[PDB]
Structure 1
Amino acid sequence: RRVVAHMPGDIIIGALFSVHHQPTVDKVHERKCGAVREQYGIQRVEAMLHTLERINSDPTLLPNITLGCEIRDSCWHSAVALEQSIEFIRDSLKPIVGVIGPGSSSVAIQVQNLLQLFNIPQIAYSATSMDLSDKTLFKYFMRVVPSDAQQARAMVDIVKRYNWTYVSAVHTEGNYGESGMEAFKDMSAKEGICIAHSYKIYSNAGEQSFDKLLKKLTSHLPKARVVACFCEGMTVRGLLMAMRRLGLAGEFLLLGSDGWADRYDVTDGYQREAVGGITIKLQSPDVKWFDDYYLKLRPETNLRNPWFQEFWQHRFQCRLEGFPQENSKYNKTCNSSLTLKTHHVQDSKMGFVINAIYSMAYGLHNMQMSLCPGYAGLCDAMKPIDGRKLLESLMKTAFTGVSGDTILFDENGDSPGRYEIMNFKEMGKDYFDYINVGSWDNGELKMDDDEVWSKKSNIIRSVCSEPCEKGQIKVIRKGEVSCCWTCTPCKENEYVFDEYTCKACQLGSWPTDDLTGCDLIPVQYLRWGDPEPIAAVVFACLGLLATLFVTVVFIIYRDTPVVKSSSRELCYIILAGICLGYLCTFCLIAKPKQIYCYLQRIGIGLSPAMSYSALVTKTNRIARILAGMSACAQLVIAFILICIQLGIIVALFIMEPPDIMHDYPSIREVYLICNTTNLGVVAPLGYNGLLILACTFYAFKTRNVPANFNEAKYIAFAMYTTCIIWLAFVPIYFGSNYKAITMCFSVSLSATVLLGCMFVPKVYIILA
């Protein structure tokens, strides 16, 4: 049978401390546990044994009655703990009023399942899983530490503070690890953090299992550089040993938890490989009187602790020949000059242990005051200590702990606490230490960023993709996870408005330089400047000068035989036509307005009509007198021709209303032109074409008949050239968007011809 500690008393309290290590993977069934522990073992046992004596000596708490204890070894294993708990409850089948719960959460759950049947309150000091907070399943359980909900919140705050997005998660198999990592996963996935892969491993797994786990961790090495470890000390140590074996010292950042905390025994020997690791340690100041008591302990004068001699041998590698447990495995013998002071560290959760024991004692005390106030001792009503009443008192108890602060239990039996964020750093040459780099308390994370990463080149941010919101490139998520994307450039037509989605603008808009939202593209038009329009207006002005010169010559030589046969009225009509033809050039090249549009249509439709309508009748009169009514009748024929033309124009004007249109030929450029349908343009052109065809027929009929210096031949030349000119611009016109400019050129050419291949001869004669 396993050995246990004893201490006599009126009320006997139980305790489960992991004096020995967890049983090896091959020896779990035998249920024998390995090496003795100092921080987790002998220190806690001695702490309990001394705090009990302190309580007994102190008259203000639990007066006139002694408090005894029964310490057993759980070996940090659920099965060993269950057997020891059976040994506790064997008396129920001096009673154990309560138990100071085991370190592990899963072990605590097993022990609690057994204890709650016998109404034995269990106060833990390091059980942190949220599962134990449920008082329906675990009624007789309290703890002097907060749950790991707060620890998961702390880890996620630390991860988000450094914008770590793509992390890898490891948690120890059990209840602490599983619950911790479930909480972390929830809160991280909620707030943008993405987990590369969540792994699990047993603390007592072999070397090969840790090797395989680390290989899987390296499978996402370049990107996922931070491993959030909701792991125990031994899991972290296993990962460190794996890093040693496979040569991975110093490219992973291990974000630990309370399992790792401040422990030197998890990073001794393997300091080089855990440098930079960030851990979360429950805040607990060193208990000074415990150190004063502990450091003076000697193996000769300490008999009440059955594991103290084994601890003495293990710590200082030696053999004590004067004791039954010689343990001749060790080579040397230890002289009576070795002390615990050399290389002494007090376990971080010592305070909590003392608090837990006090939490019980005060509880009993409160019950003592409430159940029989008068008697200063174990009254008749107290002989069978009721576990239910003790649970109630323990629930409502409050006092001042060894640390100094007050401690209380909430509705779920937890206790308020804060965390200290620590970083494992290298200070000197071959000297590594834990450095306090921040705190976390009720949601607020305070952290120095100078002590950790004393440079702008910190650990490579655990991000699965560079921030791709640089210009036209858009984020596409490949299903991998929200946090691993690739990148596709969005085209110039479209704009990005929300991530993952870029859409095209309608027809006359263009994206801004920032490439968010599209604005209105500036509208281009006929541009009074520019070489082409200025050349057009130059030609138009020269044309106008020629027209006015010709009209002057005509009007100052009226009764000259040169202009005798030619109907003066017909000539007037021709000159007016040519003038308005030239004018509509300026009427075209301008800022498109309604007054400009309607006038340009009338001008273009009328001027050819007005010129050629009189021209045809003139040629007809000549051809008829050759072939051998008229005068006024000639004028009325010309006038009815122009009348039907004007009727057609006004009809088209009414049918299709003239308005300023914003044409969009391509996706980039926008122009404004006045709404003139295909029919709206081709109708005047059609009519004028019929007119010119009739005119060429009649001119060809006349051809080269002798006249007043033979005008007919020149008129025929002009008619042929003007027909050619009209036909020339058709392909450039009817399948493009240079409407106005080419119309300007066309009309200017078609008038210069007439004003030239007519009159200009006559002017020469006038000069002669």
Structure 2
Amino acid sequence: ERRVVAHMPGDIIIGALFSVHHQPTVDKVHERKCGAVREQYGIQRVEAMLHTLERINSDPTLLPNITLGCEIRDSCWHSAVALEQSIEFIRDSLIKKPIVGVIGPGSSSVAIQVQNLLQLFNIPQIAYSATSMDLSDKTLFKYFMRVVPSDAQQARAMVDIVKRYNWTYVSAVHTEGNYGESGMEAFKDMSAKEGICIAHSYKIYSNAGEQSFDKLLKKLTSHLPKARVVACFCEGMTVRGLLMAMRRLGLAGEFLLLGSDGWADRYDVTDGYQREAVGGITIKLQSPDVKWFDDYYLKLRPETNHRNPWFQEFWQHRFQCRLEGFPQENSKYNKTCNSSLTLKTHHVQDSKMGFVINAIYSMAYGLHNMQMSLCPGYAGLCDAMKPIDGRKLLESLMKTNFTGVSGDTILFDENGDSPGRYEIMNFKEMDYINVGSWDNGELKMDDDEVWSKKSNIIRSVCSEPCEKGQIKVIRKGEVSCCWTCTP
């Protein structure tokens, strides 16, 4: 109740919807009472927003004589609360200091709802983790950009990997959802057009159980001789459940798991089942650590950081102590916060931190190019920039081309989507180790590191090529890659 907002003043104010708290319980959905505080998706991304705007105001090349402000609201990873705060943006325009554009939110569905709201008022929205290829349609989501690649780009990466190693007959398993269905149908179309055959579409949920995973493993073994590669558009723990199935049913290394981004180099899926895990090839989303972010965030102190209102709550929650003498001091904590406490103690940077920073820079560069166009000779905001036109800002943001925080030359296509830049990992008995890269179609790889020799490359084919004497290829009737050699 009476939600707080971390807002920074400036000549231009950019809205931000971060997931500071967890989504409310099933009970309080009609009440909108968020859960515990979130470290990575919350406080870290809020501080990223704040310090990135500070660093952008510091830069004299980008937006000179203009101050960038923000208004950071808690989305709580739930469509309803995000809609509440987006409505607060829409009314807070009212025309103090209207919101030019919104950053986020996290979830793709929550992003869809926030976009359906914002496009009604011509407010450009840039996402940092919304990947579902439903948002690629710009007739339905006119003002939606994103610095992350769609799920279709990842399915394209898997298609070209299966292509490169001449795997014509492959099985398919996906975690059913708005990600499984999407990635799997994109993979099906792309593979079928490239000349690859699928056994059929297998869907397994993560919370099925330790018997449905075994039934699905047997349904996958029902194609044991011909197919050996299982294209896996799967969540994180779905791969661990299938590795537990490989342990149970004793299929140790009888199949090749082409892992998705859910299982990229995340140890918690393999550890203690590393036996069956060896051999798998996984797609990881290339995300380097933003050094200067860590340098800023790890120095923070609740004694000093007052602009982030959730930082006192976060300090008490992370260290399970009580910030004695502070305004947001909470009881029910037995221990008291020691002055030695530091954020460096077991610090893990946010998964997609680089993408949050890149989206903030995307908004900043769009505003800067709009100022350079509308106000040619002016340094700050001339009368064409007062007020900023949402339509014109969108026009500029669609054209935006800049070099990201990690060296990426990030730019948006006609559909407001960003190019895919993944790195391929192989789980080898030495750990996930890098084996190649995928840059928007350009697939380079270390062929003689995933396999020792050219003979070791597992073959996945339904029917062997017909004899030079006995050539006549005849379609059996069930699959296109299964023929009968007749005279």
- Normalising by the residue count of structure 1, what TM-score does the alignment of the two structures yield? 0.54
For 2:301 and 2:225, locate their aligned partners in 1 and report how far apart those are by CA, in whole Å.
52
Distance 1:194 1:401, change over 3 A: same
Task: Give the root-mean-square deviation of aligned CA atoms.
Answer: 4.3
For 1:255 and 1:407, locate their aligned partners in 2 and report how far apart those are by CA, in whole Å.
27
For 1:173 and 1:126, locate their aligned partners in 2 and report how far apart those are by CA, in whole Å.
19
Distance 1:323 1:247, change over 3 A: farther
Distance 1:369 1:461, change over 3 A: same
Distance 1:404 1:162, change over 3 A: closer
Q: Deviations over 1:597-642 (max 9, x none)?
A: xxxxxxxxxxxxxxxxxxxxxxxxxxxxxxxxxxxxxxxxxxxxxx
| TM alignment of 1:83-482, pairs within 5 A | 83-92=84-93, 94-200=97-203, 224-233=227-236, 236=239, 252-263=255-266, 274-308=277-311, 311-312=314-315, 335-373=338-376, 375-427=378-430, 433-454=431-452, 461-464=459-462, 479-482=477-480
Q: 1:28 Cα deviation (Å)?
A: 7.0
Determine helix, strand or coil for the equivalent of 2:9.
Answer: coil
Distance 1:30 1:463, change over 3 A: farther
Q: Deviations over 1:741-760 (max 9, x none)?
A: xxxxxxxxxxxxxxxxxxxx
Distance 1:103 1:332, change over 3 A: same
Determine helix, strand or coil for the equivalent of 1:198.
Answer: strand
Match of 2:19 in 1: 18
Distance 1:8 1:180, change over 3 A: same
Determine helix, strand or coil for the equivalent of 1:110.
Answer: helix
Determine helix, strand or coil for the equivalent of 1:14.
Answer: strand
More RCO (CA 8 Å, sep 6+): 2
Distance 1:237 1:339, change over 3 A: farther
Distance 1:151 1:247, change over 3 A: same
Determine helix, strand or coil for the equivalent of 2:139.
Answer: coil
Q: 1:416 Cα deviation (Å)?
A: 3.8
Q: Check conservation: 1:423, 1:437, Cα contact below 8 A.
A: yes
Distance 1:73 1:295, change over 3 A: same
For 1:245 and 1:329, locate their aligned partners in 2 and report how far apart those are by CA, in whole Å.
44
Q: Check conservation: 1:104, 1:176, Cα contact below 8 A.
A: no
Q: Deviations over 1:373-432 (max 9, x none)?
A: 4554444543432211111122233333222344333332233443221224453xxxxx
Q: Deviations over 1:452-482 (max 9, x none)?
A: 3457786864445677759869877654433
Distance 1:277 1:450, change over 3 A: same
Q: 1:361 Cα deviation (Å)?
A: 1.1
Unpaired segments of 5 or more residues in structure 1?
428-432, 490-768
Q: 1:116 Cα deviation (Å)?
A: 0.7
Q: Deviations over 1:658-683 (max 9, x none)?
A: xxxxxxxxxxxxxxxxxxxxxxxxxx
For 2:23 and 2:221, locate their aligned partners in 1 and report how far apart those are by CA, in whole Å.
28
Distance 1:322 1:391, change over 3 A: same
Q: 1:112 Cα deviation (Å)?
A: 1.5
Distance 1:267 1:399, change over 3 A: same
Distance 1:185 1:91, change over 3 A: same
Further displaced range: 326-335 or 148-157:
326-335
Q: 1:303 Cα deviation (Å)?
A: 3.8
For 2:249 and 2:76, locate their aligned partners in 1 and report how far apart those are by CA, in whole Å.
30
Q: Check conservation: 1:437, 1:448, Cα contact below 8 A.
A: yes
For 1:203 and 1:33, locate their aligned partners in 2 and report how far apart those are by CA, in whole Å.
25
Q: 1:156 Cα deviation (Å)?
A: 1.0
Further displaced range: 152-161 or 170-179:
170-179
For 2:25 and 2:454, locate their aligned partners in 1 and report how far apart those are by CA, in whole Å.
44
Q: 1:155 Cα deviation (Å)?
A: 0.5
Determine helix, strand or coil for the equivalent of 1:306.
Answer: coil
Further displaced range: 386-395 or 440-449:
440-449
Distance 1:386 1:255, change over 3 A: same
Q: 1:366 Cα deviation (Å)?
A: 2.3
For 1:272 and 1:313, locate their aligned partners in 2 and report how far apart those are by CA, in whole Å.
40
Q: 1:224 Cα deviation (Å)?
A: 5.0
Q: Deviations over 1:641-665 (max 9, x none)?
A: xxxxxxxxxxxxxxxxxxxxxxxxx
For 1:277 and 1:110, locate their aligned partners in 2 and report how far apart those are by CA, in whole Å.
36
Q: 1:236 Cα deviation (Å)?
A: 4.9
Q: Deviations over 1:149-184 (max 9, x none)?
A: 432221012123333344333345554443332221
Distance 1:299 1:457, change over 3 A: farther
Distance 1:197 1:446, change over 3 A: same
Aligned residue-pair number: 484
Q: Check conservation: 2:153, 2:420, Cα contact below 8 A.
A: no
Q: 1:52 Cα deviation (Å)?
A: 0.9
Q: Check conservation: 1:211, 1:242, Cα contact below 8 A.
A: yes
Distance 1:239 1:64, change over 3 A: farther
For 1:346 and 1:416, locate their aligned partners in 2 and report how far apart those are by CA, in whole Å.
23
Q: 1:4 Cα deviation (Å)?
A: 4.1
For 1:105 and 1:14, locate their aligned partners in 2 and report how far apart those are by CA, in whole Å.
18
The structure having more radius of gyration, on CA atoms, is: 1
For 1:256 and 1:136, locate their aligned partners in 2 and report how far apart those are by CA, in whole Å.
32
For 1:38 and 1:223, locate their aligned partners in 2 and report how far apart those are by CA, in whole Å.
47
Q: Check conservation: 2:104, 2:111, Cα contact below 8 A.
A: yes
Distance 1:246 1:40, change over 3 A: farther
Q: Check conservation: 2:419, 2:439, Cα contact below 8 A.
A: no
Q: 1:288 Cα deviation (Å)?
A: 2.0
Unpaired segments of 5 or more residues in structure 2?
none
Distance 1:101 1:403, change over 3 A: same
Distance 1:483 1:358, change over 3 A: same
Q: Deviations over 1:509-531 (max 9, x none)?
A: xxxxxxxxxxxxxxxxxxxxxxx
Distance 1:323 1:210, change over 3 A: farther
Determine helix, strand or coil for the equivalent of 1:98.
Answer: strand
Distance 1:478 1:200, change over 3 A: same
Q: 1:294 Cα deviation (Å)?
A: 2.3
For 1:32 and 1:246, locate their aligned partners in 2 and report how far apart those are by CA, in whole Å.
45
For 2:254 and 2:225, locate their aligned partners in 1 and report how far apart those are by CA, in whole Å.
9
Match of 1:45 in 2: 46
Q: Check conservation: 1:284, 1:348, Cα contact below 8 A.
A: yes
For 2:304 and 2:371, locate their aligned partners in 1 and report how far apart those are by CA, in whole Å.
35
Q: Deviations over 1:65-90 (max 9, x none)?
A: 32222333444444444444333323
Determine helix, strand or coil for the equivalent of 1:481.
Answer: coil
- Normalising by the residue count of structure 2, what TM-score does the alignment of the two structures yield? 0.80
Q: Check conservation: 2:154, 2:420, Cα contact below 8 A.
A: no
For 1:215 and 1:300, locate their aligned partners in 2 and report how far apart those are by CA, in whole Å.
58
Larger relative helix fraction: 1
Q: Check conservation: 1:24, 1:204, Cα contact below 8 A.
A: no
Distance 1:343 1:268, change over 3 A: farther
For 1:3 and 1:270, locate their aligned partners in 2 and report how far apart those are by CA, in whole Å.
45
Further displaced range: 111-120 or 188-197:
188-197
Distance 1:345 1:82, change over 3 A: same
Distance 1:36 1:423, change over 3 A: farther
Q: 1:115 Cα deviation (Å)?
A: 1.2
Q: 1:321 Cα deviation (Å)?
A: 5.9
Q: 1:437 Cα deviation (Å)?
A: 0.7
Distance 1:332 1:239, change over 3 A: farther
| TM alignment of 1:703-742, pairs within 5 A | none
Q: Check conservation: 1:262, 1:348, Cα contact below 8 A.
A: no
Q: 1:293 Cα deviation (Å)?
A: 1.4
